[PDB]
Structures are given as structure tokens and as C-alpha cells.
Coordinates of C-alpha atoms and ligand atoms in Angstrom, one line a residue:
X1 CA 58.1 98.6 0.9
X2 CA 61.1 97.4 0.2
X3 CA 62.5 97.2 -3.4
X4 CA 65.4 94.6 -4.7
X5 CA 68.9 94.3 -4.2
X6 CA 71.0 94.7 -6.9
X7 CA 73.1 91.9 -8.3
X8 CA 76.3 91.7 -5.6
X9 CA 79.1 89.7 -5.7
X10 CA 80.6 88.3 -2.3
X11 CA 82.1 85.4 -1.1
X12 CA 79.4 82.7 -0.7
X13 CA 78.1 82.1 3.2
X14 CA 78.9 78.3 3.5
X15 CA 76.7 76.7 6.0
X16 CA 79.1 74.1 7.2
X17 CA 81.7 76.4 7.8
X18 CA 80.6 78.9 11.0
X19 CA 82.4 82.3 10.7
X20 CA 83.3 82.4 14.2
X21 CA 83.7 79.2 16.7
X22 CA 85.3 81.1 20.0
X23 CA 82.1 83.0 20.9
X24 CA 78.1 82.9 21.0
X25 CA 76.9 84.8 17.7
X26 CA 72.8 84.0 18.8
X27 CA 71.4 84.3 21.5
X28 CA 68.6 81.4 23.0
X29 CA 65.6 84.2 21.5
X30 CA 67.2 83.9 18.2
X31 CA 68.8 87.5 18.4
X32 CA 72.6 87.8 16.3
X33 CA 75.3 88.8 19.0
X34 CA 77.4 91.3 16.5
X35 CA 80.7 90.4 16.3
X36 CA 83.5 90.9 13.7
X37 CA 83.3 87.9 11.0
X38 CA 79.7 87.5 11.4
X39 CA 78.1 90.2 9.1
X40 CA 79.0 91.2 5.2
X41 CA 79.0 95.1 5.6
X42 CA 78.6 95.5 1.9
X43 CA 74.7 93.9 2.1
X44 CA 73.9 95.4 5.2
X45 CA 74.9 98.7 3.8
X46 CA 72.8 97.8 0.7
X47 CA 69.6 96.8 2.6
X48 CA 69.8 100.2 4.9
X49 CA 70.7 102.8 2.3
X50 CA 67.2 100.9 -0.3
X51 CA 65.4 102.4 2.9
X52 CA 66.9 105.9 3.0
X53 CA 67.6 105.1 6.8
X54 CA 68.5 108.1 9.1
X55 CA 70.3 107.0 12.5
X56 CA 69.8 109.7 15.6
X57 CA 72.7 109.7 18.4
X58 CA 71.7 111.0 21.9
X59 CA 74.5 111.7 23.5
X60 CA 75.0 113.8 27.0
X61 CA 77.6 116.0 28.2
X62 CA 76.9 118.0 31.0
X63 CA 79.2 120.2 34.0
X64 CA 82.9 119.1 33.0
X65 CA 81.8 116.1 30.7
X66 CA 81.7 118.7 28.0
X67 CA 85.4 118.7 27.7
X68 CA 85.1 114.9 26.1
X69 CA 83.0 116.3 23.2
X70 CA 85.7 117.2 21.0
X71 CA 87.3 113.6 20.2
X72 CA 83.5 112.5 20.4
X73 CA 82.1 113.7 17.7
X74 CA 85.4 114.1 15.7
X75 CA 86.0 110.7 16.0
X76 CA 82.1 110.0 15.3
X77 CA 82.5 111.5 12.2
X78 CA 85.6 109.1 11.1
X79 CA 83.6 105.9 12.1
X80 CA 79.8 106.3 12.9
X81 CA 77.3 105.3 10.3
X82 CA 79.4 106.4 7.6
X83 CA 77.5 107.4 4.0
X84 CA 74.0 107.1 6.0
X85 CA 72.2 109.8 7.3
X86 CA 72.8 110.6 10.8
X87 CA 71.6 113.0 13.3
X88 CA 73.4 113.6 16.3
X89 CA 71.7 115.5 19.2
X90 CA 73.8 116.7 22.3
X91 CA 72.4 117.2 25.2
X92 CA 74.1 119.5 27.2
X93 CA 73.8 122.6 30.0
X94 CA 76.2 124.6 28.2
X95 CA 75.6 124.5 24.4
X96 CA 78.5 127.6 24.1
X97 CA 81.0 124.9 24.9
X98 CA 79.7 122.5 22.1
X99 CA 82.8 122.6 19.8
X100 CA 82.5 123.2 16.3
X101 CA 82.7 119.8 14.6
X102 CA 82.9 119.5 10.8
X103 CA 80.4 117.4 9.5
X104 CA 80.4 114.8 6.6
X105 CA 77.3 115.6 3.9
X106 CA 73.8 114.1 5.2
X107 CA 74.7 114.7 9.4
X108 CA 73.5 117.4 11.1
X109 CA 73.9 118.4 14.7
X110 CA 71.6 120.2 17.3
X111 CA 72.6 121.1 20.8
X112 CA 69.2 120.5 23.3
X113 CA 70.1 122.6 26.7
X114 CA 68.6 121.1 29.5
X115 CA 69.9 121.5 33.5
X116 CA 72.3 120.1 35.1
X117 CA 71.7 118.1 38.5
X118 CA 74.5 118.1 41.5
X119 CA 74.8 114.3 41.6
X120 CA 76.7 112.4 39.1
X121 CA 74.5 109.6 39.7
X122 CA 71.4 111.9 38.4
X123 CA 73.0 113.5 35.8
X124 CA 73.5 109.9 34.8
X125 CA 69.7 108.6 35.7
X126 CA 68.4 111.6 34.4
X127 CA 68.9 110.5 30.7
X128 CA 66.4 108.6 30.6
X129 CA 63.7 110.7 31.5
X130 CA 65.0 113.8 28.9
X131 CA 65.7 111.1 26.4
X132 CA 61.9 109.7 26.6
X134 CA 57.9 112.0 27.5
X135 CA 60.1 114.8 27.0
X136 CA 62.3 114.4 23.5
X137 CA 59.6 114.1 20.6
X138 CA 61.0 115.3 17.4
X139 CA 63.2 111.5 17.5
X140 CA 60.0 109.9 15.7
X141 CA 59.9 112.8 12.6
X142 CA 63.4 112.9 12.3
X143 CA 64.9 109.7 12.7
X144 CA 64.5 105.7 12.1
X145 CA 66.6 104.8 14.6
X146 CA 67.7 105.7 17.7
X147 CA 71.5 104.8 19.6
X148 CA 72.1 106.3 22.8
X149 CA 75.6 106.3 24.0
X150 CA 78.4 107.7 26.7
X151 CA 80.3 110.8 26.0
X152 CA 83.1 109.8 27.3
X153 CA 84.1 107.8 25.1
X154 CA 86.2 107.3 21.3
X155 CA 85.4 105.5 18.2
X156 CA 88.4 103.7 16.7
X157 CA 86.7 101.5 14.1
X158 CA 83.8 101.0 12.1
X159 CA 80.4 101.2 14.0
X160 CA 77.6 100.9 11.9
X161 CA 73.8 99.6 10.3
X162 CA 75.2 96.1 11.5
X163 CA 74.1 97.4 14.9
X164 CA 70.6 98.8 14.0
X165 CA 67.4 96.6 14.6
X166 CA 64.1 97.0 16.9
X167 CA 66.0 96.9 20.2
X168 CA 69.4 96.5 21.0
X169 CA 71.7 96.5 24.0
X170 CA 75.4 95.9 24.5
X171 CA 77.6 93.5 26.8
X172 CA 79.5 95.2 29.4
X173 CA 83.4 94.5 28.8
X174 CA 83.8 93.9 32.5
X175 CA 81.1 90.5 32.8
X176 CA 81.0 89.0 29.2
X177 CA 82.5 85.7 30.7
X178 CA 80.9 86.0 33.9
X179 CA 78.1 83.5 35.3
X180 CA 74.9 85.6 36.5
X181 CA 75.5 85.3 40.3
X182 CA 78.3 87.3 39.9
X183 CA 76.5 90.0 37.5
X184 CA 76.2 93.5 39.3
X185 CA 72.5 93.5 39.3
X186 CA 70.0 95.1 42.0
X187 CA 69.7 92.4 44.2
X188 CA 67.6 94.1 47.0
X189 CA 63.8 93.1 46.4
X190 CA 62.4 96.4 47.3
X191 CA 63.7 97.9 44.1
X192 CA 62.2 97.6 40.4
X193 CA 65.9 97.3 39.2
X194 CA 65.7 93.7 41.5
X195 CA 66.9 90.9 39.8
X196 CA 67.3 87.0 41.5
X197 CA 70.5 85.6 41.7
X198 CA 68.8 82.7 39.3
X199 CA 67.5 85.2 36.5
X200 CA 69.3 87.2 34.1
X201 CA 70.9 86.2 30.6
X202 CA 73.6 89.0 30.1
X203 CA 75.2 92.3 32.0
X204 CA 74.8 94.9 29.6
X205 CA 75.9 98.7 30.5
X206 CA 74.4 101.6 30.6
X207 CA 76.5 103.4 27.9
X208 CA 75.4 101.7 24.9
X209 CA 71.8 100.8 23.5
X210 CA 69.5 102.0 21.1
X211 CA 67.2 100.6 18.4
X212 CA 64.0 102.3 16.9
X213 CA 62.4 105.2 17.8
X214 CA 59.5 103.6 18.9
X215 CA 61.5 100.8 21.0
X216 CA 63.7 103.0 22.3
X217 CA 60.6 105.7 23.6
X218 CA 59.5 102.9 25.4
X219 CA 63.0 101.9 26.9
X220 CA 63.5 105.2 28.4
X221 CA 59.9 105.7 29.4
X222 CA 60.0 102.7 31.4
X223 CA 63.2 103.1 32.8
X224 CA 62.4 106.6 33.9
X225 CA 58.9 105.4 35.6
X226 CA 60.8 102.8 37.2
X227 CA 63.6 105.1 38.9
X228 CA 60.4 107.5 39.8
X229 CA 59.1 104.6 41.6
X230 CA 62.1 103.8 43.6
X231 CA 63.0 107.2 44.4
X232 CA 59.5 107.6 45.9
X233 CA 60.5 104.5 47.8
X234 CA 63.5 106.0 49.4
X235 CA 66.3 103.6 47.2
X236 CA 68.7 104.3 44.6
X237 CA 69.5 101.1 42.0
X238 CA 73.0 100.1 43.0
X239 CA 74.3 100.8 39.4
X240 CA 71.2 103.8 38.9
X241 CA 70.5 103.9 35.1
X242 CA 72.3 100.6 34.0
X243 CA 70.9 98.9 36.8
X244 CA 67.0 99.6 35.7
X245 CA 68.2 99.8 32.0
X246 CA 69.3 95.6 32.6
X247 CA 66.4 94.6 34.4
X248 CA 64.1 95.6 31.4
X249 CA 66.0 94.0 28.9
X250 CA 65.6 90.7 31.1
X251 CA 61.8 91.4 30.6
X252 CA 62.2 92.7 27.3
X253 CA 64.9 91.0 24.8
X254 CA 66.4 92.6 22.8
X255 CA 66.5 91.7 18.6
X256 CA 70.1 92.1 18.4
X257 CA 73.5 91.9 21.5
X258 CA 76.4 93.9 20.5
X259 CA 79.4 91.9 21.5
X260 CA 82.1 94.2 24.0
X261 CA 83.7 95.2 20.6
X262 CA 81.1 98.0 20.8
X263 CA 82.1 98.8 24.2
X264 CA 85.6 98.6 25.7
X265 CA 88.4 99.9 28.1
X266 CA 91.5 99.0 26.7
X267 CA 93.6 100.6 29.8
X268 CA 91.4 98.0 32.2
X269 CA 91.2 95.4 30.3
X270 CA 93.7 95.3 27.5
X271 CA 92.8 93.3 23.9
X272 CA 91.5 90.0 24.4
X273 CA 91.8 87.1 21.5
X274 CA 88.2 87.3 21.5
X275 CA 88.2 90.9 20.2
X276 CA 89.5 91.0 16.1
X277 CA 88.6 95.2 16.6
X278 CA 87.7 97.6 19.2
X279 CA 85.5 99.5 18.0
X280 CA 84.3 102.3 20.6
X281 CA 86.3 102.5 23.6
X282 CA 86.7 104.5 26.9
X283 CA 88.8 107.8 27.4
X284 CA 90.6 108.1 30.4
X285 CA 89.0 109.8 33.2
X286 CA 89.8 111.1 37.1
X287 CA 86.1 110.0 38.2
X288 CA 86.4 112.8 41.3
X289 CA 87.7 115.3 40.0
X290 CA 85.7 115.1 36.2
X291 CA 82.5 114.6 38.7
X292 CA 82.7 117.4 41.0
X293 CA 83.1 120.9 41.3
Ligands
GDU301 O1 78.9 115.2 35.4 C1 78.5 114.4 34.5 C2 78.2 112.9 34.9 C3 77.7 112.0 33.8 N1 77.5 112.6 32.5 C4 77.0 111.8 31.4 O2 76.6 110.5 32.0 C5 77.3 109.5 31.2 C6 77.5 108.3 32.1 O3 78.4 108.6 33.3 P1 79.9 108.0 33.4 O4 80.5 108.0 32.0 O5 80.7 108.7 34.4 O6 79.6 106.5 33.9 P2 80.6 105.3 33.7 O7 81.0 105.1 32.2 O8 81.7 105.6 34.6 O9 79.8 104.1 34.2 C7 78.6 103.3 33.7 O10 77.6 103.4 34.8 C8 76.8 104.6 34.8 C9 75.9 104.4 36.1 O11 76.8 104.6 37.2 C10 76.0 104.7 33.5 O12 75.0 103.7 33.4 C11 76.9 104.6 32.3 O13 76.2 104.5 31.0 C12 77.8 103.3 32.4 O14 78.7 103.2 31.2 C13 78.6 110.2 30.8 O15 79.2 109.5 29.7 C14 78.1 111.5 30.3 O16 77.4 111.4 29.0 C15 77.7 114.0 32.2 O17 77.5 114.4 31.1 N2 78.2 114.8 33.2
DA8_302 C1 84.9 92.4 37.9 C2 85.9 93.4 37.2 C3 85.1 94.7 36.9 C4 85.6 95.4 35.6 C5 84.9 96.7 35.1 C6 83.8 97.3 35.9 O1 83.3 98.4 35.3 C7 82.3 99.1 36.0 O2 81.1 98.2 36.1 C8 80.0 98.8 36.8 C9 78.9 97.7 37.1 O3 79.5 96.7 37.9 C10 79.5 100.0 36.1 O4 79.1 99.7 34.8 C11 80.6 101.0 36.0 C12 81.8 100.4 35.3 O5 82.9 101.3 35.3 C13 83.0 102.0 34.0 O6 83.3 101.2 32.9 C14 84.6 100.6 32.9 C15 84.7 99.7 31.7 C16 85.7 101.6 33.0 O7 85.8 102.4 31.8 C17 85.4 102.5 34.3 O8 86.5 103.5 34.5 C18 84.1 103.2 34.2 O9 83.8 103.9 35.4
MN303 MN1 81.0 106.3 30.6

């Protein structure tokens, strides 16, 4: 049940005015693409705290990746859901080099140890199998459920505007591409597959979430999937992301997070189209950070 909003005063939405007239704020399912402009924090905020909501954050850092929890969480704590309850839960095979981050009031942390696989590409694939059945205190604990990269930097706010049922993100490499050139599967004899006609966005691997429930059934299906095609004798082109875009084809989700939510300002500077970046890639030696 949910009880009234109290009287607020904002600027009035005016219906023959759009917020913004550069990008697609809807998708054709009738799902919001978040972008700056669109949303009035202060309502959202209202509507989510009336619920009590408590956001979980799976996040994995395993091998050398655990050197990128530091600015993480720190930077987490600046930006992430801030005034609602939040859980983070990192995943990690050395929970002695979890640093000791200083939490606002209402956020707790807990280190899950779990093993770490030789390839990259596994430790990477992997995440969906220990995030699904493995993971089961998500539906006691938490409403929600956002499942990110490690390595990786909040800069600006991230917050309820993002939470619904299911979510994904668009990757800040394709967001003006046209499908044919999208990085999907294209071999047939993989579940990732997806035809060279099909497909409404590229989204990446390192940001989705939505709730529990949604999100169990995102990484369960994922997981069975990759199962499938390693029994098969392939490996999805793009592994995780590549299975994680083929079921949101089949699956949409209720609300897109515009590349806002996910950028590389080294690659790809600060586009017109961006008013804030908002999470953002650190700088990384893929080799070296990868191997021994
Ligand atoms: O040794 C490792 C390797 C990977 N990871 C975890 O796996 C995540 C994804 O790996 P990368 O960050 O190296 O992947 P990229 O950002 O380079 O590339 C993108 O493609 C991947 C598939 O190749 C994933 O889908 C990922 O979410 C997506 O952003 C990392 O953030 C980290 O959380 C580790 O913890 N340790
Ligand atoms: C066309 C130009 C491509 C621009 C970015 C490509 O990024 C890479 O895309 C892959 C799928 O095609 C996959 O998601 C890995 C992704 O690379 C990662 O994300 C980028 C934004 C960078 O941060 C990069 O270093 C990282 O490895
Ligand atoms: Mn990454």
C-alpha cells in the first residue's frame, strides 16, 4: 500500500513543452529512457522513501580487480542512492583486501568470498551464475537489485530515478549506431544469436539491475544459457553482455538508462548529448590488470 504524497511545490510539467528534444526519452514498449531533464528528483525521492525502499549493489572484484574497490565504494558513498537504504554486497576471492569504507547511516556492507577462475572472460561470465540459484538473502534484504562493474567511478548523482521492474543500460560505444552494426552473437549455434534484422538497443554488461525477483530471473537465465553453449563447445563473442543483450531483446526492460549511467570519458570524451556523467570508467592496462 501506498500512502499520499505530501503537498510539493515544483515547477509545473507543461505538456507542450518536451524536457528534452535531442534524444529518445521512451522507448516503442512505453519504457522512459533516463536522461538528465526528464525526471524531478524531489518526487521520485518522495514516492521511494513513502515505501521504505532498500537498494542492493552486487558488485565483483576478484584477482587484481580488487585494487579498484577503494574509489568504488568511496565514491558510491558520495553519489549512490543517497538518504535511501542501501546494501552493497562485494563479491570477492580475497575479502582481507576489501578496504575499509566509511559508510553513510542506513548502508551496510558484506564481503561474499567466492573463487576465482583463470579466465577473465569467466570471472566475467561467472557473475551471473553467483549472482542468481546461488545468492538468496537478495529477496529478505533488498527491494531492488543493481548489478554493476568494479571498475568503475561515480561522479554524479545515481539514484531511485533508475529503479523499476527491469532495467538495462546503453552502451556508450553504440547509442547512435544502427543494429547491423551492434556487437551481438551473430553465429546461430549460440543462445546469445541475434539476426542482423532484430535487436532494439546494445546495452553492456556492466550496468543492469531492477527487482529482486526480475533480476533472479535475469541472471538465472543468463547463466542456463552460457551452461548451454559451453556444453556446445562456443563462447558468446562478448560472454556475459552478449547473453545479457539477447534476453533483454526477448525480455524488455520497464526502464533504459541513457550512456549517462555508463561512460568512458578518455574514449569518448563529453558529447552535447550528455548534460552529466554520472558513472564512468577508470583507467585500466586490460593485460596486465587481467593476468598474473
Ligand atoms: O580479473 C577480473 C576480471 C573481471 N572482474 C569483474 O568483471 C567485471 C567486468 O570485466 P571488465 O571490467 O574487465 O570488462 P569491460 O568493462 O572491459 O568490458 C565489458 O564486457 C565484459 C565482457 O567482456 C562484461 O560484460 C562487462 O560488464 C562489460 O562492461 C569487472 O568490472 C570486475 O567486476 C574481476 O573482478 N576480476
Ligand atoms: C565502435 C567503437 C567502439 C567503442 C567502445 C567499445 O567498448 C567495448 O565494447 C565491447 C562490445 O563491442 C565490450 O562491451 C567491451 C567494451 O570495452 C569496455 O568498455 C569501453 C567503454 C572502455 O571503457 C573499454 O576500455 C572497456 O574494455
Ligand atoms: Mn568494466
Amino acid at each position: 500500500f501506498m500512502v499520499s504524497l505530501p503537498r510539493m511545490v515544483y515547477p509545473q510539467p507543461k505538456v507542450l513543452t518536451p524536457c528534452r528534444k535531442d534524444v529518445l526519452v521512451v522507448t516503442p514498449w512505453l519504457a522512459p529512457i533516463v536522461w538528465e531533464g526528464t525526471f524531478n528528483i524531489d518526487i521520485l525521492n518522495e514516492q521511494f522513501r513513502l515505501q521504505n525502499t532498500t537498494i542492493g549493489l552486487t558488485v565483483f572484484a576478484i584477482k587484481k580487480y580488487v585494487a579498484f574497490l577503494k574509489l568504488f565504494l568511496e565514491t558510491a558513498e558520495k553519489h549512490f542512492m543517497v538518504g535511501h537504504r542501501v546494501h552493497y554486497y562485494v563479491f570477492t576471492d580475497q575479502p582481507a583486501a576489501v578496504p575499509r569504507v566509511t559508510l553513510g547511516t542506513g548502508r551496510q556492507l558484506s564481503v561474499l568470498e567466492v573463487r576465482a577462475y583463470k579466465r577473465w572472460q569467466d570471472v566475467s561470465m561467472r557473475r551471473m551464475e553467483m549472482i542468481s540459484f546461488c545468492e538468496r538473502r537478495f529477496l529478505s534484504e533488498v527491494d531492488y537489485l543493481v548489478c554493476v562493474d568494479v571498475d568503475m567511478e561515480f561522479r554524479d548523482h545515481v539514484g531511485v530515478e533508475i529503479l523499476t521492474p527491469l532495467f538495462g543500460t546503453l552502451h556508450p560505444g553504440f547509442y547512435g549506431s544502427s543494429r547491423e552494426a551492434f556487437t551481438y552473437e551473430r553465429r546461430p549455434q549460440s543462445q546469445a544469436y541475434i539476426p542482423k534484422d532484430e535487436g532494439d538497443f546494445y546495452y553492456m554488461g556492466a550496468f543492469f539491475g531492477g527487482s529482486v525477483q526480475e533480476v533472479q530471473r535475469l541472471t538465472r537465465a543468463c547463466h542456463q544459457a552460457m551452461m548451454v553453449d559451453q556444453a556446445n563447445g562456443i563462447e558468446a563473442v562478448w560472454h556475459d553482455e552478449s547473453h545479457l543483450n539477447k534476453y533483454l531483446l526477448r525480455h524488455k526492460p520497464t526502464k533504459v538508462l541513457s550512456p549517462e549511467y555508463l561512460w568512458d570519458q578518455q574514449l569518448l570524451g563529453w558529447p552535447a548529448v550528455l548534460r552529466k556523467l554520472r558513472f564512468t570508467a577508470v583507467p585500466k592496462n586490460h593485460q596486465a590488470v587481467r593476468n598474473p
